[PDB]
Amino acid sequence: GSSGSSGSGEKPYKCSECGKAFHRHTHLNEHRRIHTGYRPSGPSSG
Ligand SMILES: [Zn+2]
């Protein structure tokens, strides 16, 4: 089988997009920003 899971204790918030983790939800959210494709130009021009 596999071996590991040594040292219990993992941040409560974890990014389920790339594989990042943070202690303060705040930070995590600020990160996702990049995951939500942050582009200047939108579907329309105005
Ligand atoms: Zn991420």
Q: Tell me, what CATH number does 37's domain have?
A: 3.30.160.60
Give a yes or no: residue 34 inside a domain.
Answer: yes
Q: For residues 21 and 12, what is the distance between their CA atoms, to the nearest angstrom?
A: 8
User: What are residue 22's DSSP bridge partners?
Assistant: 13
Q: How far is the CA of 39 from the centre of ligand 1 (A)?
A: 17
Print the domain residue range for 38. 11-46
In DSSP terms, 13 is beta-bridged to 22
Taking the C-alpha atoms of residue 12 and residue 5, their distance in angstroms, rounded to an integer, is: 16
Q: Judge whether 17 lies within some domain.
A: yes
Q: Is the dihedral of CA 16, 25, 31, 44 positive or negative?
A: positive
32 Cα: distance to centroid of ligand 1 (angstroms): 6
- Please count the structural domains in the chain: 1
C-alpha of residue 7 to centroid of ligand 1, in Å: 23
